[PDB]
Amino acid sequence: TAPAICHDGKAHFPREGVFVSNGTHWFVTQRNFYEPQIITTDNTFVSGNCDVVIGIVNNTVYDPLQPELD
């Protein structure tokens, strides 16, 4: 696990849930039942930069807007 994810130089925190890794990819899960979803901009919120969080990791946070606009 990791407390936050870095994307575009910004720190992303979960709205509810924890970040988990299955060995090769990272997902967001709810805390009481294992049910992974992809980490998006609708699942998370932004606060601060990736210089203050200890243990923050690099990953991709997917924006739904751009693949709709091709």
């Binding site: 696990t1 407390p3 925190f13 924890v18 601060g48 969080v53 200890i54 243990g55």
Partner: protein
């Protein structure tokens, strides 16, 4: 300290402590980023 409040409802589930304290702030109305950007201050204040 190692399992938070999970051992009282079943099996003890490990979770790192910094992340336990962030959950505990959420439970009182404080966002979790307030802890993670001030982790050193809260640890100094607790230890004193």
């Amino acid at each position: 300290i190692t399992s938070g409040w999970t051992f009282g409802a079943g099996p003890a589930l490990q979770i790192p402590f910094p992340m336990q304290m962030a959950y505990r702030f959420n439970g009182i109305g404080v966002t979790q980023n307030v802890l993670y950007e001030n982790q050193k201050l809260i640890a100094n204040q607790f230890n004193s």
